[PDB]
Design a protein around this ligand. Structure first.
Ligand SMILES: CCCCCCCCCCCCCCCCCC(=O)OC[C@H](COP(=O)([O-])OCC[N+](C)(C)C)OC(=O)CCCCCCCCCCCCCCCCC
Ligand SMILES: CCCCCCCCCCCCCCCCCC(=O)OC[C@H](COP(=O)([O-])OCC[N+](C)(C)C)OC(=O)CCCCCCCCCCCCCCCCC
Ligand SMILES: CCCCCCCCCCCCCCCCCC(=O)OC[C@H](COP(=O)([O-])OCC[N+](C)(C)C)OC(=O)CCCCCCCCCCCCCCCCC
Ligand SMILES: CCCCCCCCCCCCCCCCCC(=O)OC[C@H](COP(=O)(O)OCCN)OC(=O)CCCCCCCCCCCCCCCCC
Ligand SMILES: CCCCCCCCCCCCCCCCCC(=O)OC[C@H](COP(=O)(O)OCCN)OC(=O)CCCCCCCCCCCCCCCCC
Ligand SMILES: CCCCCCCCCCCCCCCCCC(=O)OC[C@H](COP(=O)(O)OCCN)OC(=O)CCCCCCCCCCCCCCCCC
Ligand SMILES: CCCCCCCCCCCCCCCCCC(=O)OC[C@H](COP(=O)(O)OCCN)OC(=O)CCCCCCCCCCCCCCCCC
Ligand SMILES: CCCCCCCCCCCCCCCCCC(=O)OC[C@H](COP(=O)(O)OCCN)OC(=O)CCCCCCCCCCCCCCCCC
Ligand SMILES: CCCCCCCCCCC1=C(C)C(=O)C(OC)=C(OC)C1=O
Ligand code: SF4
Lengths: 156, 98, 80, 110, 169, 314, 42, 70, 105
């Protein structure tokens, strides 16, 4: 009918707006933050996708966890995650944030950042290249594109 | 006479009664004092402009300058007593009863 | 007296420039020959009406018409 | 007449934009957040430096209010007197600045 | 009702004075005083004093009430029946005065005031190729030599005084 | 009929602000050996629309504000004072022809700091209040030199009217007899709108940390409108254009080009230098700019008397 | 003549000097990474 | 390369050219094909009101010349 | 004590402002120049006690120029009678008082 068409077009509009202006915050913990800085370099140019460089935590959309999440750092990570306005997304970069990586069996390393925050995109590597993090960002954009919030609201 | 004169006199009287009855803070007294000056400014300016007294047009500028210097001195005194007591309350300025 | 100026111009040139500009501004209008021109340009600007005088009989200097030869002249202003 | 119409239009456009910016995510039903400055509960420390620069600005602003009618005042016939008074006023401005300078008034916010 | 614009502005002026004079909080008193100063500048502008109203905006509001609110932000740490009571009674005397003015077109409290619109007192002639208030202010450097001298000396002495008393020694 | 004039003034201001965001992103990218946004639209032409919609569907912060009244009122004042400082601008004919338009602009610019003060006080954070107080002090301290420079420049004009400023520069640009005032005015307007290398609130808390994304966007839009307005005012003051009374489009195109070049110079400045410290810019103002401003003010009072070049009062 | 009202009235000090009745502390959290505790005096 | 900033600058230039052109065209249209008359002083306003009264249409830009005198 | 330093020294520190009928810039007249001039030409040289009684009518004329209570009262009475006659319906306003006059110049 008409209402389903209207909510489908509005959903496409809001998903295009959200996926094309992803403002990231980056947790500069370890090596993978240096590789994030290298993706923000002129060669790969995160800004040209609408993805700004080092936005504020109070206005960012996607939060990137690039490095090792230790036991002394995890409550601060949760506190930063809780203050982000919705819609919020989390990208895990590298093995240390994915599952612990080299320091998985350590006494002071959280075995994956998914034990603290919900994670949408997992980027594998040690460090994953700037190409790989760019691919993960674009895959997150694809995930945002196929969201169906207004259709779900109309059907309920 | 005119009506806006009556309104400016009543505004001055309201600000004077506000100054003359302190509530808690010294800053509210300073605000009432400066509202009194503002009412004086408006009254004198209206009288001078309506009377076409050309050479009296410089008076409200001098009045504003002198009363703002007064207000600067008062703000400095308020800052000094706030540094002494930690607050600008008028009930702490009672050492000189004895 | 002479090396002091050089030292203070090497160290604080901004204050040297400020004081020099101030001294120029305070000693130049008393020295220029064009201040009198400003005086008689400001005093020759006709803001209000030139009210005529009743002819008693003895005013050879006061003209009876604007195009009459007698009266103030602004040829110095037209040439300068 | 036209000026206050323009003022009202600017005010109502600003308040319309602010109302839409506030109350439009209010129609969203996102979540309820609990949320349980580097200083936790420290009192604001009173600094004499910020008050000093504020009062210095106020006094210089007053002497600016005195200096303002110079473009109109330059058209007077008494040009020597007006020039002398203008130079005296700006010289008093400079002297007040120099007194603030020498007695360490502009210190740590130079 | 458009002929009563200065009267309506004066009503707003005195209402703001009642509001800020009730002393709810120093910052709210500052906000009410800012609004009252803006309305009073509107009164002066509608009377013909463009320069004096713009002085009110530039010096009183933009230059001095900034200092008042700036000092208010450095004290009076952030988080009544009396405030509401005096605000209500001040509004009551104000509106009673307005009704008694407009019902009989004359009033006496201390002086005798007339209830007609205040456009009657205006002058029927033109000022020529200049504004009278600007020439009156501009005569400060030509006529007011003594006024300039005493005002500038008082300002410099005020700078010295403020520097003296805030030092603490 | 007049409301059409008001609307065609105020809607292109918002359009120019959004495309100023896009232009600044692209120019900074091309100045940092990279590209700006070119994926969202053709050469990024659709980036402000997407960014605006995203910011207007963002979750609000919902702070524990001490006063919701001034929390509402601060963006109101910021946007109203950003939009109301355009009406006496001659383009070549001002929308509201004011006899004292220059001093009206000075009054509005002096009134603009209440948004910073109320935004700092409304947020419960004390560090936000401290940042707001520092920003207010810097803003008023540069208001001082703005006023002195404008006063000293106006002595070549003869009145406060903005339309006469075109007539004064009918022969030569005003940057030729007043270039030190032009440099000091440009730096003072750069520090007036809180821009680099004077944007201390972005360097190590802002005055609007607790504000929601929508009101933050409104504050930022007001700041960019202030930037464009200040550059247009500087162009009118020092780089006046040739105005044909039969073809106003010549003046409109000329000052549009000059003001766009000045705003691009603002963006060029913001990506070349490190930021100042607070005491360093206070030193730059109270101890470098102010004495030279006073000396040049005395020079430009005493100069037209000694040159027999008093500008006409009317 | 001391009364009941004038019972808490102490004499003034001999030198007429009354006693005057710390510094700011900031906790810059981890929001590489580093925490800082700053004792600041303005 | 660098010439790709030009569409954004062109859109900004159009949006800055619009208000001045609109203001000039509105002033010329609303004042009978002439500039909007400036009245900064009371003498110019008195001339304005005299011309409005002498127009016979209650409209200050309808200016009548030698066709009115006898 | 009122030490007349200005008259002793010959300086003019505040006499230019002290009255409205004095020397004003650009020969701008005030609204009540003539009344104030007549009142001053009365009161000069006779003291306050004699000037408070002798030609008080000049001061009454000056005060009536300054504040205009009698003119306002007369206009109020005329307008009140006009309003009463208009409401009771025995007065029709003329064309020139309703905006249909096409004024002189
Ligand atoms: C012009 C500048 C920009 C202006 C704003 C942007 C333009 C587009 C405005 C309409 C966008 C769609 C509605 C607002 C965004 C809703 C997003 C959202 O969260 O939706 C889920 C929400 C809620 O859906 P829900 O019921 O699934 O809730 C999910 C949340 N839980 C389960 C936790 C409760 O939808 C809405 O709130 C509907 C709002 C109105 C829908 C559109 C009506 C017609 C509009 C034309
Ligand atoms: C320190 C003060 C320096 C300036 C002193 C006055 C210089 C000057 O121009 O005087 C002539 C001016 C103006 O003289 P004038 O001749 O131009 O004035 C003609 C008369 N009127 C004003 C109507 C145009 O002042 C005077 O003659 C009298 C006023 C000042 C008297 C001296 C005050 C000294 C106070 C010391 C404390
Ligand atoms: C609008 C037109 C365009 C304007 C220019 C735009 C492009 C240029 C942008 C430049 C970079 C901007 C970003 C940085 C801004 C901050 C830095 C800054 O501006 O610092 C200012 C610096 C700061 O000085 P400073 O801090 O280096 O000074 C040293 C001071 N001590 C030693 C105490 C530390 O300079 C000034 O303030 C000077 C201002 C201009 C002076 C003009 C003088 C004119 C000549 C007078 C006469 C000289 C001859 C002698 C006398 C002769 C008499 C006959
Ligand atoms: C008779 C003389 C006074 C005339 C004006 C009276 C206005 C109404 C006041 C009623 C009494 C309110 C009161 O108790 O005020 C006391 C208060 C200071 O006391 P506080 O510390 O605030 O609290 C203790 C309260 N007993 O003081 C205040 O709050 C002072 C507030 C004054 C506000 C005046 C407003 C205008 C009034 C009409 C015009 C005059
Ligand atoms: C008489 C002319 C008109 C005067 C009135 C108008 C003045 C306009 C300018 C106003 C300036 C106001 C502020 C002046 C402050 C001067 C005092 C000062 O700052 O002294 C300190 C300074 C040394 O600096 P420091 O102690 O380290 O302070 C930290 C900054 N570095 O010390 C110095 O750097 C030395 C400063 C004093 C010596 C300056 C000499 C300049 C000479 C220029 C050429 C001559 C010009 C003609 C006038 C005669 C000057 C003597
Ligand atoms: C003062 C001047 C100010 C100017 C401001 C604006 C500047 C930029 C102007 C626009 C530049 C070009 C934008 C092109 C957008 C993409 C158009 C397009 O082709 O979209 C295709 C997309 C998918 O189409 P689909 O049918 O799925 O494809 C399958 C077929 N093989 O379909 C869709 O996405 C749905 C349809 C989208 C249509 C978008 C059209 C452009 C929208 C521009 C908005 C602003 C317009 C100007 C407003 C101010 C002036 C009036
Ligand atoms: C009742 C019916 C109407 C109901 C309400 C709906 C109103 C219209 C809303 C816009 C049109 C709906 C469709 C939105 C886009 C859907 C199609 C799509 O996803 O297109 C993708 C395409 C770019 O493809 P992409 O995935 O980005 O690929 C990157 C390159 N490899 O994208 C493009 O080519 C560009 C897409 C542009 C979308 C339109 C332009 C922006 C929106 C303009 C109107 C709203 C905002 C107006 C201005 C507000 C203030 C800023
Ligand atoms: C928290 C509260 C809300 C805050 C946001 C809204 C308020 C603040 C932002 C807007 C500020 C507006 C300032 C308005 C006054 C500015 C001065 C002014 O009007 O100047 C223009 C003009 C004088 O120039 P001139 O050329 O001489 O006049 C024509 C002569 N032929 O003068 C004229 O043309 C005079 C025209 C008639 C009189 C106009 C009076 C306007 C209404 C009164 C003031 C309104 C603002 C009150 C609040 C202030 C801020 C709290
Ligand atoms: C009527 C509303 C018009 C849209 C609002 C103003 C334009 C959008 C600004 C968004 C924005 C952009 C593009 C942006 O790039 C940016 O980074 C510098 C911002 O600040 C963090 C922004 O706010
Ligand atoms: S995943 Fe590898 S590169 Fe990344 S932080 Fe861990 S050790 Fe470093």
């Amino acid at each position: 009918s008409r209402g389903e068409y209207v909510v489908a077009k509005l959903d496409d509009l809001i998903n295009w707006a959200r996926r094309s202006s992803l403002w990231p915050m980056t947790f500069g913990l370890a090596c993978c933050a240096v590789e994030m800085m290298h993706m923000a370099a002129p060669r790969y140019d995160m800004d040209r996708f609408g993805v700004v460089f080092r936005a504020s935590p109070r206005q960012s959309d996607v939060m990137i966890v690039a490095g090792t999440l230790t036991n002394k750092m995890a409550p601060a990570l949760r506190k930063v995650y809780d203050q982000m306005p919705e819609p919020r997304y989390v990208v895990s970069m590298g093995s240390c944030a994915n599952g612990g990586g080299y320091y998985h069996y350590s006494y002071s390393v959280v075995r994956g950042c998914d034990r603290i925050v919900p994670v949408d995109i997992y980027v594998p590597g040690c460090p994953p290249t700037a190409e790989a993090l760019l691919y993960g960002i674009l895959q997150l954009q694809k995930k945002i594109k196929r969201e169906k919030r207004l259709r779900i609201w109309y059907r309920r | 006479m005119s009506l806006v004169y009556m309104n400016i006199m009543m505004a001055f009287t309201v600000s004077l009664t506000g100054l003359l009855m302190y509530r808690s803070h010294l800053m509210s007294s300073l605000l009432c004092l400066e509202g009194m000056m503002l009412s004086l400014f408006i009254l004198a300016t209206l009288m001078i402009l309506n009377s076409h007294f050309t050479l009296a047009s410089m008076m409200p500028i001098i009045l504003l300058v002198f009363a703002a210097c007064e207000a600067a001195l008062g703000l400095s005194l308020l800052v000094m007593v706030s540094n002494t007591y930690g607050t600008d309350y008028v009930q702490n300025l009672n050492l000189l009863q004895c | 007296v002479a090396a002091f100026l050089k030292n203070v111009w090497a160290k604080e040139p901004v204050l040297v420039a400020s004081f020099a500009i101030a001294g120029l501004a305070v000693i130049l209008p008393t020295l220029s020959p064009y201040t009198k021109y400003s005086l008689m340009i400001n005093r020759a600007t006709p803001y209000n009406y030139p009210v005529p005088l009743r002819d008693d009989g003895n005013m050879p200097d006061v003209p009876s018409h604007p195009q009459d030869p007698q009266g103030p002249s602004l040829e110095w202003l037209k040439r300068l | 007449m036209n000026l206050m119409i323009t003022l009202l239009t600017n005010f109502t456009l600003a308040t319309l934009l602010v109302t839409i910016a506030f109350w439009l995510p209010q129609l969203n039903v996102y979540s309820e957040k609990t949320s349980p400055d580097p200083m936790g509960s420290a009192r604001l420390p009173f600094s004499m430096k910020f008050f000093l620069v504020a009062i210095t600005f106020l006094l210089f602003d007053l002497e600016i209010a005195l200096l303002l009618p110079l473009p109109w005042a330059s058209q007077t016939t008494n040009l020597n007197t007006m020039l002398t008074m203008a130079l005296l006023l700006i010289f008093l401005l400079a002297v007040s600045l120099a007194y603030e300078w020498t007695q360490k008034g502009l210190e740590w916010t130079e | 009702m458009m002929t009563y614009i200065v009267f309506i502005l004066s009503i707003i002026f005195v209402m703001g004075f009642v509001g800020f004079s009730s002393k709810p909080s120093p910052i709210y008193g500052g906000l009410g005083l800012i609004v009252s100063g803006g309305v009073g500048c509107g009164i002066v502008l509608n009377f013909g004093g463009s320069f004096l109203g713009l002085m009110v905006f530039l010096i009183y509001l933009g230059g001095m009430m900034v200092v008042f609110g700036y000092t208010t932000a450095m004290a009076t740490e952030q988080y009544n029946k009396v405030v509401l009571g005096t605000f209500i009674t001040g509004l009551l005397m104000e509106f009673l005065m307005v009704y008694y003015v407009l019902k009989d077109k004359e009033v006496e409290i201390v002086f005798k005031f007339n209830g007609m619109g205040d456009w009657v007192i205006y002058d029927t002639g033109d000022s020529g190729f200049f504004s009278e208030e600007a020439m009156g202010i501009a005569a400060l450097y030509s006529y007011g030599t003594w006024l300039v001298i005493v005002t500038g000396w008082s300002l410099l002495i005020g700078v010295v005084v403020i520097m003296e008393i805030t030092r603490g020694n | 009929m007049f409301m059409i004039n008001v609307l065609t003034l105020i809607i292109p201001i918002l359009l120019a602000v959004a495309f100023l965001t896009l232009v600044e992103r692209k120019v900074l990218g091309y100045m940092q050996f990279r590209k700006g946004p070119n994926v969202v639209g053709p050469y990024g032409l659709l980036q402000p629309i997407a960014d605006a919609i995203k910011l207007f569907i963002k979750e609000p912060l919902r702070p524990a504000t001490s006063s919701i009244s001034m929390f509402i009122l601060a963006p109101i004042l910021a946007l109203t004072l950003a939009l109301t400082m355009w009406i006496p601008l001659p383009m070549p004919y001002p929308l509201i022809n004011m006899n004292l338009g220059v001093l009206f602009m000075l009054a509005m610019s002096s009134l603009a700091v209440y948004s910073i003060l109320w935004s700092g006080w409304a947020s419960n954070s004390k560090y936000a209040l401290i940042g707001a107080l520092r920003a207010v002090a810097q803003t008023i301290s540069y208001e001082v030199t703005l006023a002195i420079i404008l006063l000293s420049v106006l002595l070549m004009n003869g009145s406060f009217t903005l339309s006469t400023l075109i007539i004064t520069q009918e022969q030569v640009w005003l940057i030729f007899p007043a270039w030190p005032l032009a440099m000091m005015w440009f730096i003072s307007t750069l520090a007036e709108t809180n821009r680099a290398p004077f944007d201390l609130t972005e360097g190590e808390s802002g005055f609007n940390v607790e504000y929601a994304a929508g009101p933050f966007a409104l504050f930022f839009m007001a700041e960019y409108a202030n930037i464009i307005m200040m550059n247009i005012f500087t162009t009118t003051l020092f780089l006046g254009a040739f105005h044909n009374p039969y073809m106003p489009e010549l003046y409109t195109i000329n000052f549009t080009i000059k003001s766009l070049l000045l705003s691009i110079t603002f963006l060029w400045i913001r990506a070349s230098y490190p930021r100042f410290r607070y005491d360093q810019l206070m030193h730059l103002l109270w101890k470098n700019f102010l004495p030279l401003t006073l000396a040049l003010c005395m020079w430009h009072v005493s100069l037209p008397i000694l040159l027999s070049s008093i500008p006409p009062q009317t | 003549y001391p009364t009941k009202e004038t019972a808490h009235w102490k004499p003034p000090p001999w030198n007429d000097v009354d006693p005057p009745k710390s510094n700011l502390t900031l906790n810059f959290g981890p929001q590489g990474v580093l925490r800082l505790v700053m004792e600041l005096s303005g | 390369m660098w010439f790709e900033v030009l569409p954004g600058i062109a859109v900004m230039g159009v949006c800055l050219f619009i208000p001045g052109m609109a203001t000039a065209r509105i002033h010329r249209f609303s004042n009978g094909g002439r500039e909007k008359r400036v009245a900064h002083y009371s003498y110019q306003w008195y001339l304005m009101e005299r011309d409005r009264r002498v127009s016979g249409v209650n409209r200050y830009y309808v200016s009548k010349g030698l066709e009115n005198i006898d | 004590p009122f030490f007349d330093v200005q008259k002793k020294l010959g300086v003019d520190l505040d006499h230019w402002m002290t009255i409205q009928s004095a020397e004003q810039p650009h020969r701008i007249p005030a609204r009540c120049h003539a009344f104030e001039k007549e009142w001053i030409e009365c009161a000069h040289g006779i003291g306050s006690i004699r000037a408070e009684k002798e030609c008080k009518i000049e001061f009454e004329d000056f005060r009536e120029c300054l504040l205009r209570q009698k003119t306002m009262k007369r206009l109020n009475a005329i307008k009140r009678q006009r309003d009463k006659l208009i409401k009771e319906g025995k007065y029709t306003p003329p064309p020139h008082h309703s905006g249909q006059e096409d004024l002189r110049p």
